[PDB]
Design a binder for these strands. Structure first.
Lengths: 91, 98
DNA sequence: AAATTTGGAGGAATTTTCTCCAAATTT
DNA sequence: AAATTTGGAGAAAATTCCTCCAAATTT
C-alpha cells in the first residue's frame, strides 16, 4: 500500500520496508532535538531542497537525461523542471 | 571552535553499517533509496504524479512534527516553516490534520 | 484585561502551466 | 530524412503572500 518505502534492519538481521515518512519524521525529531530553543526560520525550503535534489537526480537518471520525459513523469512543466535543475546547479 | 555541518547532515537518519555501527546518514539518501526501490518495482509503467507523490509523502510528517513542536499554534508553525498561515491551513486541511 | 491566535475575506505578488516557435539533437 | 528534444519567449491559469478585521482563545 505504501509506494515510497526504504529498507531497515533489526537486531535479528531481518530486513523490512518502512515508509519514507518515518525517515522524514525521525530526521525532524532529531533536528528539533539537537537545537535547544534556537529559532527555526525556513524549515520548508530546507526539507524541500533536501528532498527535491535526490528526486531530480534519480528522475534524470531514470530518463537518461531526457527532461521532457522527466517532467512528464513528475507531473510538472518542462520549464518548472528546468528552473529546479538550475536552482540546484544540475545542468 | 565550530565545526562545519553540511546541509546534508542537518536532517539525518540512523543507519547500521557493515561493522554494525550506528551512523547518521542524510535524509537525501533515504529519499534516493525510496525512489530507487520505486523505480525498481515499476517494471515499465507510466507515471504522471511523482512530484505530488513525494511531496505529500514528505509534507505530512513535516506538518505533523511542526504542529507537535508548536503545540497546535498555526502562526508559530507557519513562521518557522517560512510559509503563509493561510498556506499552512490549506496544507493542514489537505491532509486532514486541521 | 491585555495579548495573541484564528478563520476568512479581497487583492497584489509570485509561481506554474500553456502554447507557441526555431535551433539543436536524437532516432 | 523524419521525429524528438531543448531553450525561451509571452500570456493565461493558478498558487502563494499580503493586509487587513472581528470573533475566539490564551496569557
Amino acid at each position: 500500500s505504501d509506494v515510497l518505502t526504504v529498507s531497515t534492519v533489526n537486531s535479528q538481521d531481518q530486513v523490512t520496508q518502512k515508509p519514507l515518512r518515518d525517515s522524514v519524521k525521525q530526521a525532524l525529531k532529531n533536528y528539533f532535538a539537537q537545537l535547544n530553543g534556537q529559532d527555526v526560520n525556513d524549515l520548508y525550503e530546507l526539507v524541500l531542497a533536501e528532498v527535491e535534489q535526490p528526486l531530480l537526480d534519480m528522475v534524470m537518471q531514470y530518463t537518461r537525461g531526457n527532461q521532457t520525459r522527466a517532467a512528464l513523469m513528475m507531473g510538472i512543466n518542462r520549464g518548472t523542471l528546468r528552473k529546479k535543475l538550475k536552482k540546484y546547479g544540475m545542468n
